[PDB]
Design a protein around this motif. Structure first.
Motif, short mmCIF file in Angstrom:
data_model
loop_
_atom_site.label_atom_id
_atom_site.label_comp_id
_atom_site.label_asym_id
_atom_site.label_seq_id
_atom_site.Cartn_x
_atom_site.Cartn_y
_atom_site.Cartn_z
N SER A 70 0.02 -2.10 13.70
CA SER A 70 0.23 -2.03 11.94
C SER A 70 -0.96 -1.39 11.55
O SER A 70 -0.87 -0.74 10.27
CB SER A 70 0.47 -3.39 11.35
N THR A 71 -2.09 -1.30 12.11
CA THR A 71 -3.43 -0.62 11.25
C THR A 71 -3.07 0.92 11.15
O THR A 71 -3.23 1.56 10.02
CB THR A 71 -4.54 -0.82 11.98
N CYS A 72 -2.22 1.40 12.08
CA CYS A 72 -1.98 2.84 12.00
C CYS A 72 -0.87 3.03 10.80
O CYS A 72 -1.17 3.97 10.15
CB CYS A 72 -1.25 3.33 13.34
N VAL A 73 0.06 2.06 10.86
CA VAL A 73 0.92 2.26 9.78
C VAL A 73 0.31 1.95 8.28
O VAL A 73 0.64 2.65 7.30
CB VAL A 73 2.26 1.28 9.68
N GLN A 74 -0.59 1.30 8.32
CA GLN A 74 -1.34 0.83 7.04
C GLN A 74 -2.33 1.98 6.65
O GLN A 74 -2.12 2.44 5.43
CB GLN A 74 -2.46 -0.30 7.33
N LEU A 80 -0.69 9.11 3.34
CA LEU A 80 0.55 10.11 3.44
C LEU A 80 1.64 9.86 2.44
O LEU A 80 1.56 8.42 2.20
CB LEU A 80 1.10 10.28 4.86
N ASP A 81 2.48 10.49 2.15
CA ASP A 81 3.62 10.41 1.58
C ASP A 81 4.72 9.83 2.59
O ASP A 81 4.69 10.25 3.84
CB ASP A 81 4.51 11.63 0.96
N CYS A 82 5.52 8.57 2.34
CA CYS A 82 6.10 8.03 3.45
C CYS A 82 7.10 6.97 2.91
O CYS A 82 6.92 6.56 1.71
CB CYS A 82 4.95 7.03 4.38
N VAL A 83 8.25 6.76 3.64
CA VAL A 83 9.15 5.55 3.28
C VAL A 83 9.09 4.65 4.59
O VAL A 83 9.61 4.94 5.64
CB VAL A 83 10.69 6.19 3.16
N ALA A 92 10.41 -5.91 8.74
CA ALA A 92 10.53 -5.42 7.14
C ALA A 92 9.36 -6.27 6.66
O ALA A 92 8.33 -5.75 5.94
CB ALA A 92 11.45 -4.90 6.52
N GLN A 93 9.56 -7.34 6.34
CA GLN A 93 8.75 -8.38 5.75
C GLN A 93 7.55 -8.50 6.47
O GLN A 93 6.72 -8.56 5.59
CB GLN A 93 9.56 -9.80 5.65
N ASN A 94 7.71 -8.53 7.64
CA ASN A 94 5.94 -8.57 8.34
C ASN A 94 5.02 -7.52 8.03
O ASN A 94 4.14 -7.64 7.69
CB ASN A 94 6.43 -8.80 10.07
N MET A 95 5.77 -6.20 8.17
CA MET A 95 4.90 -5.03 7.61
C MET A 95 4.66 -5.28 6.06
O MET A 95 3.49 -4.83 5.75
CB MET A 95 5.83 -3.77 7.77
N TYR A 96 5.71 -5.62 5.12
CA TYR A 96 4.98 -5.72 3.76
C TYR A 96 4.07 -6.54 3.90
O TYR A 96 3.17 -6.14 3.00
CB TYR A 96 6.45 -6.28 3.02
N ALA A 97 3.91 -7.71 4.40
CA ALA A 97 3.03 -8.72 4.60
C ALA A 97 1.65 -7.69 4.86
O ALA A 97 0.52 -8.18 4.25
CB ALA A 97 3.27 -9.94 5.42
N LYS A 98 1.78 -7.24 5.99
CA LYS A 98 0.60 -6.52 6.27
C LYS A 98 0.17 -5.28 5.74
O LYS A 98 -0.82 -4.42 6.09
CB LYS A 98 0.85 -6.06 7.90
N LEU A 99 1.05 -4.82 4.81
CA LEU A 99 0.63 -3.55 3.93
C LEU A 99 0.26 -3.91 2.55
O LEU A 99 -0.70 -3.33 1.97
CB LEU A 99 1.85 -2.62 3.84
N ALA A 102 -3.67 -5.30 2.01
CA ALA A 102 -4.51 -4.21 2.03
C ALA A 102 -4.68 -3.38 0.79
O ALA A 102 -5.60 -3.11 0.14
CB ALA A 102 -4.70 -3.14 3.31
N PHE A 103 -3.52 -2.88 0.35
CA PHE A 103 -3.13 -2.27 -0.93
C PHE A 103 -1.81 -2.51 -1.40
O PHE A 103 -1.13 -3.41 -0.96
CB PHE A 103 -3.42 -0.61 -0.54
N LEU A 104 -1.32 -1.40 -2.19
CA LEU A 104 0.01 -1.81 -2.65
C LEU A 104 1.08 -0.94 -1.90
O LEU A 104 0.71 0.03 -1.53
CB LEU A 104 0.02 -1.22 -4.18
N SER A 105 1.90 -1.53 -1.32
CA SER A 105 3.23 -1.23 -0.73
C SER A 105 4.58 -1.45 -1.55
O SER A 105 4.55 -2.59 -1.80
CB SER A 105 3.24 -1.67 0.72
#
Lengths: 766, 24, 154
Positions: A70-74, A80-83, A92-99, A102-105
């Motif tokens: 997830s650090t790479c995804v962060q 980058l521009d990304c969806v 999806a919720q786990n990634m939201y929690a981990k994004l 750090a900042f806004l996702s």
DNA sequence: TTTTTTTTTTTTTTTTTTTTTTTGA
């Protein structure tokens, strides 16, 4: 602080590759035209469908699960521009929690939502038409046509719904002088695929190969109807697939409508499709587009790590490994006995085994005397549905109980549906609303760390914690952050109401043994001194619909309690801080399991999260119109008004009690290409998190694990998945030794990663 | 149990009447 | 029986609001003081109750627990033909295992019964006429006043 | 003695607001 260093400096080459992969313009002729997706709608069967290439790129991020991939995804999200998407709602919720840590996702949804998956697609015949690939070597066009024929009953419906919707959108703005960058902002509710070409799919191994092409296909759709600026720039999708290739698998279920035998076969996931297909490994150039994350962070053991290495990399199993895993084996009757390993999640390799194990513990706890309480779950079939479907199955003779012999799994969320102890179905015709209804009982345990399975609407009724825990909530306004930044006024109204309602709690603590007369005297004296600069007295609560009101009226109440907490905190030392503080907006009395929240007013209406670890509390009825958003569905809505629907109450990690709604799910599958709403299943959709299947365990990590292995069915991938769900090898017990018993090892993707670890153009991140 | 009194039963006898059925 | 939210604006104290949380029987003592004041002492805590033989109930509904019985009772009050027991939970029916003897006959031995504490004694009239009509309920006709007079000696 | 048949994921559109308590034979 040094833990991030390797990721920080090794993700940069990844970032400096995805950029050119996303900024590569295609030739004009290679761009899929709108007329292509127009012809696809015209086609009825997926046979005359023309061979059409849909260009795409990939970048693979593999690595141990919980390798901190997830650090790479962060880093990707903030640069980058990304969806960002996810294969499962939990992921999806786990990634939201981990994004958002750090900042806004932006709200991370599933890839299925992104390409338009809706309710009716859930039970759709996704494996019907055949394909004899004119292949070997398999052209990319043939592979894409296979994946579109696989999903014809989904691709066709998506194309038809997108096309026949009509044209304005970007087509309008593009002709500003004949500004599409500001188009998704001004024209809202537009699909998120219209604003980026880098699609990150996390835990993509949970998706089958059919989806890969599908996603690319859908991408081009949503960039052709809307004529996106990316489509004018001739850009192509790049699918950054992040997931574990040897700790995750995808399964396809097909139900035969006469034998009533639901079968689940194994499938090729997106990761395996990309790694192991010579056509995709060349077109996508996986050699220059592959990143393997190699470190298991959570793990802090040594022998545990070596075993994970040998299992993941397919290394030969030696005697030393057998002796190491020998220290975990505990008897069959020790795991299955509920008196042993309390608080340890138990994994089985069969849903029947879990249904057996959950029932025995229920009996144990009940006889020994948490509370083993009984809660209703119903079902609603219809006469016409099981009349016409029986007609179309070439067998018009089939009993309703035999209809529920296997479709009970296929009537709601499978996971809890086939892993629950429940009673006997009381299928009684309630045709008043032209229906036939069923009734069983899904016994739970009281006060356990249960997890929400489906999407539920949480309604917080108050906080059952300590004075210190509530002071903390107000000090950092963590609760306000959980409700989102756009609607903070709703969060501030309810906290204000709670503080004006929880004033009586201080007065009960006044009756505490071991306190001096003058200790209590100084208590009430400082209460009076604070009232002097403020006793409940007659404070005027409430505020108008104004932003200033929730930052002035609440500001007083926040400062009032904060001070008041800290005031008696000094007066009674640690005793006051630990004292149990319960604040509710209504007289809430909870004798045994039954609760009573009286009459609700919908003070704060929110949505429960599946990842949030809740705690089972009790089944208050207190019929709320907030959950009663009932509008088929109305025929059962009338019966839900008739029979009081129990709303189960859960306690989150903070301790706030929340009353939730029920769950309703449809079964629609047929064989005559006539998808009709058969049966809707009303139940609760909660999982114990105490026993589960190995296959479902792939999704989420566990604290303590006891594995029950069935001999003969031993697959070393299942052993590796089961043993890798826990961080520490200390808290791990098992039935037998998977290394000492006969095991069917499938080390084909393992050698592919090994050859990837043996390639100069593959980026390894430590 | 949470109880705050600061967060009754109706009298079902005629305390007032303004219209009735005049039989006499 | 009085309903909690119907008497929410009553602002009662403790023990007088938790007894009627769903609905609760109130033994009202009407009378006079020696100086002529009309008093109505609303007594709280009195519950109607009956007995069922422990083994008989354990068999006929595998009530392997006193509360497993309360679940069977509330399941019946849910299946009730007409919706008179809305919301009824497993806590309106507290039970214990008592060691009583049937008055009939002398050869009778003291068995084990369940003493099932109903509230809202019309539910006891249902749970006495419609609950498992092949088990024998013992004192399900004894109203709450008699329980008040008898349970309190004097 | 043959002898089985194992596991999963996705299904949105919003945040407030009209209360009722004898039934049976």
């Amino acid at each position: 602080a040094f833990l991030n260093f390797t990721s920080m400096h090794g993700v940069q080459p990844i970032l400096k590759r995805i950029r050119e992969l996303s900024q590569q313009q295609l030739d004009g002729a290679q761009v899929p035209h709108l007329q292509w997706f127009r012809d696809v709608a015209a086609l009825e069967s997926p046979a005359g469908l023309p061979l059409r290439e849909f260009p795409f790129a990939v970048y693979l991020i593999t690595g141990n699960a919980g390798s901190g991939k997830s650090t790479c995804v962060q880093t990707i999200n903030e640069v980058l521009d990304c969806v960002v998407t996810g294969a499962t709602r939990i992921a999806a919720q786990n990634m939201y929690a981990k994004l958002s840590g750090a900042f806004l996702s932006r709200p991370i949804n599933t890839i299925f939502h992104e390409f338009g998956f809706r309710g009716n697609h859930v039970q759709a015949q996704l494996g019907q038409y055949p394909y004899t690939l004119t292949s070997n070597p398999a052209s990319l066009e043939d592979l894409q046509r296979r994946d579109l024929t696989y999903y014809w009953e989904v691709i066709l419906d998506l194309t038809k719904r997108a096309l026949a919707a009509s044209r304005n959108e970007f087509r309008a703005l593009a002709a500003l002088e004949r500004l599409t960058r500001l188009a998704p902002a001004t024209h809202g509710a537009l699909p998120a695929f219209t604003r980026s070409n880098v699609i990150v799919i996390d835990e993509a191994g949970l998706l089958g190969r059919h989806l890969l092409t599908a996603v690319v296909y859908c991408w081009w759709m949503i960039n052709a109807l809307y004529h996106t600026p990316q489509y004018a720039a001739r850009l192509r999708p790049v699918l950054v697939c992040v997931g574990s290739p040897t700790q995750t698998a995808s399964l396809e279920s097909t139900f035969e409508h006469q034998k009533l035998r639901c079968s689940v076969r194994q499938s090729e996931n997106v990761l395996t499709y990309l790694i192991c297909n010579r056509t995709l490994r060349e077109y996508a150039r996986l050699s220059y587009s592959w990143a393997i994350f190699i470190n298991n962070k959570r793990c802090v053991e040594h022998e545990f790590g070596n075993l994970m290495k040998v299992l993941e990399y397919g290394l030969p199993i030696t005697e030393e490994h057998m002796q190491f895993v020998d220290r975990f084996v505990v008897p069959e009757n020790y795991i299955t006995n509920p008196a042993n390993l309390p608080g340890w999640t138990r994994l089985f390799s069969s849903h029947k085994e879990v249904s057996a194990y959950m029932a025995k513990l229920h009996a144990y706890l009940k006889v020994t005397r948490f509370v083993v309480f009984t809660l209703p779950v119903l079902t609603f079939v219809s006469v016409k549905e099981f009349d016409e479907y029986r007609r179309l199955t070439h067998q018009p003779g089939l009993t309703i109980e035999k209809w529920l012999t296997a479709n009970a799994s296929r009537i709601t969320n499978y996971s809890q549906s086939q892993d629950q102890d429940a009673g006997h179905m009381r299928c009684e015709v309630h045709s008043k609303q032209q229906l036939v209804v069923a009734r069983n009982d899904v016994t739970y345990v009281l006060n356990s760390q249960i997890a929400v399975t489906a999407r539920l609407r949480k309604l917080v009724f108050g906080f059952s914690g300590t004075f210190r825990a509530f002071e903390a909530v107000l000090r950092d306004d963590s609760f306000v952050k959980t409700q989102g930044e756009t609607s903070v006024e709703f969060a501030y109204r309810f906290l204000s109401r709670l503080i004006f309602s929880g004033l009586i709690s201080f007065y009960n603590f006044l009756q505490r043994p071991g306190l001096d007369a003058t200790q209590r005297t100084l208590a009430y004296a400082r209460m009076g001194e604070l009232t002097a600069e403020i006793f409940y007295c007659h404070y005027t609560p409430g505020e108008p619909e104004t932003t200033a009101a929730v930052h002035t009226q609440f500001a007083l109440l926040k400062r009032a309690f904060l001070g008041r907490f800290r005031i008696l905190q000094e007066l009674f030392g640690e005793a006051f801080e630990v004292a149990p503080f319960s604040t509710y907006v209504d007289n809430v009395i909870f004798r045994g399991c039954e609760m009573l929240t009286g009459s609700p007013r919908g003070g704060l209406m929110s949505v429960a999260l599946q990842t949030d670890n809740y705690t089972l509390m009790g089944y208050t009825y207190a019929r709320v119109f907030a959950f009663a958003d009932e509008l088929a569905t109305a025929n059962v809505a009338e019966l839900l008004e008739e029979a009081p629907l129990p709303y189960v109450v859960l306690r989150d990690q903070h301790g706030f009690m929340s009353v939730v709604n029920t769950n309703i799910s449809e079964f629609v599958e047929s064989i005559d290409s006539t998808e009709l709403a058969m049966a809707i299943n009303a139940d609760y959709g909660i999982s114990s998190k105490l026993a589960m299947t190995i296959t479902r365990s792939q999704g989420l990590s566990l604290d303590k694990v006891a594995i029950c292995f069935t001999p003969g069915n031993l697959r070393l991938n299942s052993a590796y998945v089961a043993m890798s769900r826990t961080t520490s090898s200390e808290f791990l017990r098992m039935n037998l030794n998977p290394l000492r018993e006969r095991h069917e090892r499938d080390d084909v993707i393992s050698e592919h990663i090994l050859s990837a670890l043996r390639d100069p153009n593959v980026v390894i991140v430590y | 149990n949470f109880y705050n009194p600061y967060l009754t039963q109706r009298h079902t006898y005629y305390s007032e009447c303004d219209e009735f059925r005049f039989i006499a | 029986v009085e309903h909690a939210y119907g008497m929410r604006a009553a602002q009662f104290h403790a023990r007088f609001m938790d007894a009627i949380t769903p609905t609760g029987t109130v033994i009202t003592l009407l009378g006079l003081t020696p100086e002529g004041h009309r008093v109505a002492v609303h007594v709280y805590g009195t519950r109607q109750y009956f007995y069922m033989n422990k083994e008989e109930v354990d068999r006929h509904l595998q009530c392997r627990a006193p509360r497993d019985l309360c679940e069977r009772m509330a399941a019946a009050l849910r299946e009730s033909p007409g919706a008179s027991f809305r919301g009824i939970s497993a806590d309106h029916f507290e039970a214990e295992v008592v060691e009583r003897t049937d008055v009939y006959y002398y050869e009778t031995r003291p068995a084990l019964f369940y003493r099932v504490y109903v509230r809202s004694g019309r539910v006891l009239s249902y749970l006495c006429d419609n609950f498992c009509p092949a088990i024998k309920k013992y004192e399900g006709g004894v109203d709450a006043t008699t329980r008040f007079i008898l349970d309190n000696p004097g």
